[PDB]
Structures are given as structure tokens and as C-alpha cells.
Amino acid sequence: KDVITKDMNQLPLPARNFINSNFTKPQVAHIKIDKDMMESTKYEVVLMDGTEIDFDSKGNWEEVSAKKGQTVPVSIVPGFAVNYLKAHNFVNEGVTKVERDRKGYEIELSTGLSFKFDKKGKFIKT
Known part of the structure; x- marks a missing residue:
């Protein structure tokens, strides 16, 4: 129930x-x-x-998913993804969604740009 x-x-x-x-x-x-x-x-x-x-x-x-116009706490963003956002100068966009499952990780930014990674934190070429 x-x-x-x-x-x-x-x-x-x-x-x-x-x-x-x-x-x-x-x-x-x-x-x-x-x-x-x-x-x-x-x-x-x-x-x-x-x-x-x-x-x-x-x-x-x-x-973890933030409401429209808000962003998630930087503390929940996995290290490898913080590193990726810094490497590509996306530190100021704001992360609105972090997801994990058997396939790896998904990170979405306030703009709607999103990235998927595998379980080792490697961007999934798709």
C-alpha cells in the first residue's frame, strides 16, 4: 500500500x-x-x-533534482563531475540534477545541457 x-x-x-x-x-x-x-x-x-x-x-x-530557477547543493555533485565542470568552464551554470544508476551518472545544468558518464566517471561517447 x-x-x-x-x-x-x-x-x-x-x-x-x-x-x-x-x-x-x-x-x-x-x-x-x-x-x-x-x-x-x-x-x-x-x-x-x-x-x-x-x-x-x-x-x-x-x-537529486532542484526546482526551476534553483540548483542542487555543490556538495552532492560527485568529485569527477565537479572536475569535469571546472575543466570545461561550466562552474557558474549551476547543477539542477544529479542521477546515478547501474549505467553510471547523469549531471544536468540550469540551461538544460546534460552529460552522462559511466560508473568510472568517464563521459559516455554516444
């Missing part, structure tokens, strides 16, 4: 720690708790500042 809650304490500890460490004065707008098609629990957290954070059943972040 799906659940909507406003209680941060329903999240696994690693998920609460991630929010606490990376966001300024975070407060829950709402959290949806459901399952994927393999019967694994999923958490979709939306903060009052508009940011969405999706977590797996163990509390590992899968995606």
Missing part, C-alpha cells in the same frame, strides 16, 4: 543523514513510500525548498 507522509523519520538512517548533511535547514513537503516492480521499497522525498531526492530501500540516494 502506498504512503504519503510528512515525517522525515520514516526514512532509513542513511537517507536522513544524507539530507541532514547536504541541505540547509531541510524540511519535508511530502514523502512518498512505494514499491518498484521487483517489490523493492522506494522513497521519493520533496523538500519545502522544492528539491526532490529519490532513495532506494536502504536509503541510498538515486537522484
Whole structure:
């Protein structure tokens, strides 16, 4: 059965720690708790500042997405991607989405420019 809650304490500890460490004065707008098609629990957290954070059943972040006109905390941006943005002079664009999964990583900028990388942080030639 799906659940909507406003209680941060329903999240696994690693998920609460991630929010606490990376966001300024975070407060829950709402959290949806459901399952994927393999019967694994999923958490979709939306903060009052508009940011969405999706977590797996163990509390590992899968995606952080900022609201239009906002950007994600630089602290969540993986090192290799910070390095890439600096190497290509994109430090001042703002990152609006960071995603990770079995294929690697995706980073989106405020402009809509986006980049995918493999699990070792290498840009995927496509």
C-alpha cells in the first residue's frame, strides 16, 4: 500500500543523514513510500525548498533534482563531475540534477545541457 507522509523519520538512517548533511535547514513537503516492480521499497522525498531526492530501500540516494530557477547543493555533485565542470568552464551554470544508476551518472545544468558518464566517471561517447 502506498504512503504519503510528512515525517522525515520514516526514512532509513542513511537517507536522513544524507539530507541532514547536504541541505540547509531541510524540511519535508511530502514523502512518498512505494514499491518498484521487483517489490523493492522506494522513497521519493520533496523538500519545502522544492528539491526532490529519490532513495532506494536502504536509503541510498538515486537522484537529486532542484526546482526551476534553483540548483542542487555543490556538495552532492560527485568529485569527477565537479572536475569535469571546472575543466570545461561550466562552474557558474549551476547543477539542477544529479542521477546515478547501474549505467553510471547523469549531471544536468540550469540551461538544460546534460552529460552522462559511466560508473568510472568517464563521459559516455554516444
